[PDB]
């Protein structure tokens, strides 16, 4: 069974950084892109970027180039997203979602999301 297991909710002060995780199981990790998505009420879904776990090549929404850092660790089948220089605009639910490298273009499995709140 495919699972994407995300990390626990975070509550941090403005200016801090956080690292969220998404552990994949039940499939060949390196055969699927990992996408990261920001959900804030009133703003639908916002794409952050994607990473190719075979080599860690990234593509970002230019809005997040100076905010997010995507990495993977292949041996532990885990994708990470660091968010830097945090502000209240960063408060949101964040998701990881896989997409096959080999020419299907649907999402299928999503993580359950991690809440980030940036306050005081």
């Amino acid at each position: 069974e495919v699972q994407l297991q995300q990390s626990g909710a975070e509550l941090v002060k403005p200016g801090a950084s956080v690292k969220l995780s998404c552990k994949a199981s039940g499939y060949t990790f390196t055969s699927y892109w990992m996408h990261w998505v920001k959900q804030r009420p009133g703003r639908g879904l916002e794409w952050i970027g994607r990473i190719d776990p075979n080599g860690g090549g990234t593509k970002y929404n230019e809005k997040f180039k100076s905010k997010a850092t995507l990495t993977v660790d292949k041996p532990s089948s885990t994708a990470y997203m660091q968010l830097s220089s945090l502000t209240s605009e960063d408060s949101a639910v964040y998701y990881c979602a896989r997409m096959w490298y080999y020419g299907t273009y649907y999402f299928d499995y999503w993580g359950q999301g991690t809440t980030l709140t940036v306050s005081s």
Binding site: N61, K63, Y105, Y106, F107, D108
Partner: protein
């Protein structure tokens, strides 16, 4: 960047065939955008439905289908069920970057 727009809300009745659409500020949505659709059910449970305009993900009910209708991408639900009440997001590719529409809340009354 491109702005991808969806109906904010649609109401249907059980058993109806309903179509949700996805437009782009750039002009026509084409197969080169590889439109995809995702469903968010209550408790933030996301499932992929459609990719590459018209390809249904394995295990998705066959009543969901994707197409282009005019200059928009479209998700058709053929025989709406109670459990299809959800938010549906579309997303379009431009230069290897994904842009989500704002989502459509589908209410199924009954």
């Amino acid at each position: 960047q491109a702005v991808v727009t969806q109906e904010s809300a649609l109401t249907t009745s059980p058993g109806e065939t309903v179509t949700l659409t996805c437009r782009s500020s750039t002009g026509a949505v084409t197969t080169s955008n590889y439109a995809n659709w995702v469903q968010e059910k209550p408790d933030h449970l996301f499932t992929g439905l459609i990719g590459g305009t018209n390809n249904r993900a394995p295990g998705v009910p066959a009543r969901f289908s994707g197409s282009l209708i005019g200059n928009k991408a479209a998700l058709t639900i053929t025989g709406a069920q109670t459990e299809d009440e959800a938010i549906y997001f579309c997303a379009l590719w431009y230069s290897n970057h994904l842009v989500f529409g704002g989502g459509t809340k589908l209410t199924v009354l009954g």
